[PDB]
Short mmCIF file of C-alpha atoms and ligand atoms in Angstrom, two decimals:
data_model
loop_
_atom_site.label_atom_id
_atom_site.label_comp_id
_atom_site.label_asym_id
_atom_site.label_seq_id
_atom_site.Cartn_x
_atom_site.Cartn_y
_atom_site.Cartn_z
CA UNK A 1174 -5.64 -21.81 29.91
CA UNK A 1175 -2.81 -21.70 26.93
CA UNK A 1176 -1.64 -18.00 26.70
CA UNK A 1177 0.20 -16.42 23.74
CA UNK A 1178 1.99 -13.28 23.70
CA UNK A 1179 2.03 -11.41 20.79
CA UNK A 1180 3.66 -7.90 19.77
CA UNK A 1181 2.54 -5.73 16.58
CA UNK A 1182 5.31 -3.98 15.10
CA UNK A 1183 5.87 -1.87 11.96
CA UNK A 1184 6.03 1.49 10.74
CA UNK A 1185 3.71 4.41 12.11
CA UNK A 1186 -0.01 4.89 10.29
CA UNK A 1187 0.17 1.39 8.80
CA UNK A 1188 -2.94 -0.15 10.95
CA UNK A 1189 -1.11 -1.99 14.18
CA UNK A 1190 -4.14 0.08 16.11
CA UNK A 1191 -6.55 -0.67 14.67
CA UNK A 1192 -5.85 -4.03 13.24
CA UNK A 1193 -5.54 -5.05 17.64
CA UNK A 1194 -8.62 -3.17 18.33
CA UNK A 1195 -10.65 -4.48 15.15
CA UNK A 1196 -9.44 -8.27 16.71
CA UNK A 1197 -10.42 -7.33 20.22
CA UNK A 1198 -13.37 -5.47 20.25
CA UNK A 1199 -14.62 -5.96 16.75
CA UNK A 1200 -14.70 -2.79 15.24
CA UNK A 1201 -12.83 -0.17 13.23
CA UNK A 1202 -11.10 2.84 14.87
CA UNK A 1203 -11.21 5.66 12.94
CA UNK A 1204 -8.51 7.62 15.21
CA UNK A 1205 -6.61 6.05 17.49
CA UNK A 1206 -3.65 8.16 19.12
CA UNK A 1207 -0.32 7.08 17.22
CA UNK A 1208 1.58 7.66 20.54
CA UNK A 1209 -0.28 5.32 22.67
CA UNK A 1210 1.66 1.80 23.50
CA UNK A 1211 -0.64 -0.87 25.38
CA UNK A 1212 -1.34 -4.36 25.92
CA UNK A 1213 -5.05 -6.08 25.04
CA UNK A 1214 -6.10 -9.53 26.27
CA UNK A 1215 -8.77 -11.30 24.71
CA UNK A 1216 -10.24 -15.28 26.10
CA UNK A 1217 -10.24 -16.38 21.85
CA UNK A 1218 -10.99 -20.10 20.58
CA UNK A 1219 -8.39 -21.28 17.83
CA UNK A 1220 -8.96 -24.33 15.75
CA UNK A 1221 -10.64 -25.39 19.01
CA UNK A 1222 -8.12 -24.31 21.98
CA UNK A 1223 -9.01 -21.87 24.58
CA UNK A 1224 -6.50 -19.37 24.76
CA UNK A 1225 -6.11 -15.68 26.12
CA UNK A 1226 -4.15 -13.63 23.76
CA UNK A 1227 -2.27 -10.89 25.15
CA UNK A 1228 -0.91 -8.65 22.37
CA UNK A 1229 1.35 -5.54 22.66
CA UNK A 1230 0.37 -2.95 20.04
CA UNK A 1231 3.32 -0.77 20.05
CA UNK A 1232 3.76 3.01 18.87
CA UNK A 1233 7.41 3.83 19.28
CA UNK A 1234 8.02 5.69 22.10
CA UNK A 1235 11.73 6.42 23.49
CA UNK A 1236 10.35 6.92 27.04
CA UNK A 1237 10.80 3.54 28.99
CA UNK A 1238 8.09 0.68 29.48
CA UNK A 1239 8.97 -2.01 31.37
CA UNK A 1240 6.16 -3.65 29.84
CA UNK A 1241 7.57 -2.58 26.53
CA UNK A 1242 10.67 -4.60 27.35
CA UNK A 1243 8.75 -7.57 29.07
CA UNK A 1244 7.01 -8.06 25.67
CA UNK A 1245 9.67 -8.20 22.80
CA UNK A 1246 12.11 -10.54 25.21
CA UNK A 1247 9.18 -13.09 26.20
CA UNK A 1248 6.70 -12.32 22.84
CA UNK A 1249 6.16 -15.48 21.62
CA UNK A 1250 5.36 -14.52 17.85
CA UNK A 1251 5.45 -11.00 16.18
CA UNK A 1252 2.96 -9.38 13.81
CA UNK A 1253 5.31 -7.26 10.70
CA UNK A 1254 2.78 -4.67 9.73
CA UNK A 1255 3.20 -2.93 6.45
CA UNK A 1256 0.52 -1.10 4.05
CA UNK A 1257 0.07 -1.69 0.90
CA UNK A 1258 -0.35 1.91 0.25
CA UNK A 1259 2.36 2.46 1.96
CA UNK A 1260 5.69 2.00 -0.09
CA UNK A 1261 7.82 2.92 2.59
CA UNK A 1262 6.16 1.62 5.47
CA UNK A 1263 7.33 -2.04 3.02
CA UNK A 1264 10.64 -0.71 2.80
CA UNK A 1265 10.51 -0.45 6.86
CA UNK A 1266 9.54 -4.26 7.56
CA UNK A 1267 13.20 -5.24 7.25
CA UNK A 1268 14.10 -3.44 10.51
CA UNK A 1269 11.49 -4.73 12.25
CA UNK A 1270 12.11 -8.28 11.45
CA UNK A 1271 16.03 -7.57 12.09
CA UNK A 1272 15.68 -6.34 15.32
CA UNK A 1273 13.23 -9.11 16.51
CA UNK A 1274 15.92 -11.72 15.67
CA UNK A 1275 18.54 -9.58 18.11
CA UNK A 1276 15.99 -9.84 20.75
CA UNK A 1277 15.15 -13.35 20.28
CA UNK A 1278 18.73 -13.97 19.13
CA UNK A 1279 17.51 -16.27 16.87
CA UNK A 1280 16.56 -16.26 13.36
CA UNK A 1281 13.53 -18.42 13.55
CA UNK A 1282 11.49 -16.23 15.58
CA UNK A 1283 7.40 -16.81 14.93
CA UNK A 1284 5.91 -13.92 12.77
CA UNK A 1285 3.85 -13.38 10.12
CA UNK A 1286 4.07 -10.50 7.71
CA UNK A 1287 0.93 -8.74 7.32
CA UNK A 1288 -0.07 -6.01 4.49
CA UNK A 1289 -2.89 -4.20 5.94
CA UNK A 1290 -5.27 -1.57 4.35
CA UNK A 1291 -6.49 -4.14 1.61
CA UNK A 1292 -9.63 -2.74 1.14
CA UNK A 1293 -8.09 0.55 -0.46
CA UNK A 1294 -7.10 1.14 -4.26
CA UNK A 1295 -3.96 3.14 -3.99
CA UNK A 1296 -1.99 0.34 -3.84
CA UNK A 1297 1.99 0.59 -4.48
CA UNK A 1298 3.20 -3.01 -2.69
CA UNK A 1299 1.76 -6.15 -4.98
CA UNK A 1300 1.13 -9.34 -3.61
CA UNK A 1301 3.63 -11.02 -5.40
CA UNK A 1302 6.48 -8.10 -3.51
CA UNK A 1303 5.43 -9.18 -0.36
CA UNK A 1304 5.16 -12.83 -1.00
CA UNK A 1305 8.51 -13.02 -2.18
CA UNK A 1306 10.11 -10.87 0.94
CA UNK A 1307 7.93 -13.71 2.79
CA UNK A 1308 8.85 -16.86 1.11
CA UNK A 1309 12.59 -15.34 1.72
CA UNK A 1310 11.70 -14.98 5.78
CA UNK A 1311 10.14 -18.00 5.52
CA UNK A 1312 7.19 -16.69 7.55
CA UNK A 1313 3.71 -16.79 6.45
CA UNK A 1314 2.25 -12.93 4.59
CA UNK A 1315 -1.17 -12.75 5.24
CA UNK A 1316 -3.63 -9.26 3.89
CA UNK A 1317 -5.33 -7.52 6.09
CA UNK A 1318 -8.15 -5.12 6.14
CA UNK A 1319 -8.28 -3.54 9.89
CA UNK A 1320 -12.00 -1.54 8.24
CA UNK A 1321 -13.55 -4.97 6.78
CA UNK A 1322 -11.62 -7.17 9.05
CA UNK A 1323 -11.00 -9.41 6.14
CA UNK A 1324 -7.55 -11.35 7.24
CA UNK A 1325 -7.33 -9.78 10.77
CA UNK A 1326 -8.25 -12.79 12.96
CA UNK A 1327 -6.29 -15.06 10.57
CA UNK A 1328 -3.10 -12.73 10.82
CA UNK A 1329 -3.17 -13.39 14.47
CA UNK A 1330 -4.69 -16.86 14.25
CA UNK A 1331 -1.81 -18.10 12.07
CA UNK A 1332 0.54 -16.19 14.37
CA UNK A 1333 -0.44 -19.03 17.12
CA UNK A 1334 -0.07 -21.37 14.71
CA UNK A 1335 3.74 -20.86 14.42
CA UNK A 1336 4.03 -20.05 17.69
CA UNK A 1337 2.46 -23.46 18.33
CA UNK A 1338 5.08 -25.03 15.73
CA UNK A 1339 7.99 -23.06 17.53
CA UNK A 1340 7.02 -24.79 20.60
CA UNK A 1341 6.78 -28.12 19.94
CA UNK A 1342 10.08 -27.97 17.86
CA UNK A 1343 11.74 -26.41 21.27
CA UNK A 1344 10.69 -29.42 23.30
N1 GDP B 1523 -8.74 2.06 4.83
C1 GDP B 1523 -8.10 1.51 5.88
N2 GDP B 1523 -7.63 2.35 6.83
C2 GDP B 1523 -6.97 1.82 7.90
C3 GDP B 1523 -6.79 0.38 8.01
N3 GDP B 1523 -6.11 0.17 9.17
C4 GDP B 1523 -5.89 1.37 9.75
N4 GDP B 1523 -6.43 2.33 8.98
C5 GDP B 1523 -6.42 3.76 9.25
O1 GDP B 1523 -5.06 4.25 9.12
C6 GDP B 1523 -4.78 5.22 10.14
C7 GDP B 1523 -3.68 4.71 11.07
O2 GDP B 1523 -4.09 3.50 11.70
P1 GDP B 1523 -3.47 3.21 13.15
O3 GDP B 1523 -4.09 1.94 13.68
O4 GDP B 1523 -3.47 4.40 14.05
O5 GDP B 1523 -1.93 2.85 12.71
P2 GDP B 1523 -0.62 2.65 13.66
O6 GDP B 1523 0.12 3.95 13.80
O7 GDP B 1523 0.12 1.56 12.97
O8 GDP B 1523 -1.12 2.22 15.01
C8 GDP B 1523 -6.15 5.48 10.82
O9 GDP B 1523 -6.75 6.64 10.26
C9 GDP B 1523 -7.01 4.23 10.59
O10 GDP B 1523 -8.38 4.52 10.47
C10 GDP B 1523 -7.35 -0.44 6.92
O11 GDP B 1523 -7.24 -1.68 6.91
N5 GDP B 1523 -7.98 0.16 5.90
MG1 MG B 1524 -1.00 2.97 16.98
#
């Protein structure tokens, strides 16, 4: 009955794709067309609430969506995807997170930072990095593994959980 919209956002190639589609459907996407912008719902039970999520997994298109549009103004919380192979991809959550306070024109905006590809050895970004960018968000970091799905449903779980925070604070 409770809906929460959510939006993925972070660099290209860092697992938005398939971290939605390992939530959603429960399995690991091996290719997944890094052009293609969409919306999933999914009927989910959190710490006992019914809820449909309805998450935006976005690819960073110029051509116009007004779904696109509809999403970042009335997303309720916002998945910051990095790798942790992915040095730059790190580099890139900044932006994100910048530009999701000017839509929200806010600065306490719910969102959870999420290092995905956790399963992999090549990593560059430590935990302790992406902590700290974290504990100076103050949003909650969360790994992720989109091929195990070790952390998925909690990066999206907790993601409620600060949208459900955010709400009750607003009223
Ligand atoms: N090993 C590993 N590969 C991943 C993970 N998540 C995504 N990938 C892969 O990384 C590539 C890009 O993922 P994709 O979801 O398209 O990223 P997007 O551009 O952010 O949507 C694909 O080849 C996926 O199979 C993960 O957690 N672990
Ligand atoms: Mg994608």
């Amino acid at each position: 009955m409770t809906e929460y919209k959510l939006v993925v956002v972070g660099a290209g190639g860092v697992g938005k794709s398939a971290l939605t589609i390992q939530l959603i459907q429960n399995h690991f996407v091996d290719e997944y067309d890094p052009t293609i912008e969409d919306s999933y719902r999914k009927q989910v039970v959190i710490d006992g609430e019914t809820c449909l999520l309805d998450i935006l997994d976005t690819a960073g298109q110029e051509e116009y969506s007004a779904m696109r549009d509809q999403y970042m103004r009335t997303g309720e919380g916002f998945l910051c995807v990095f790798a942790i192979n992915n040095t730059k991809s790190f580099e890139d959550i900044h932006h994100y997170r910048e530009q999701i306070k000017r839509v929200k024109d806010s600065e306490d905006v719910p969102m959870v930072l999420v290092g995905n590809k956790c399963d992999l050895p090549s990593r560059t970004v430590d935990t302790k990095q992406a902590q700290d960018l974290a504990r100076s968000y103050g949003i909650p970091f969360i790994e992720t593994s989109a091929k195990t799905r070790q952390g998925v449903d909690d990066a999206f779980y907790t993601l409620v959980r600060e949208i459900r925070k955010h709400k009750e604070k607003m009223s």
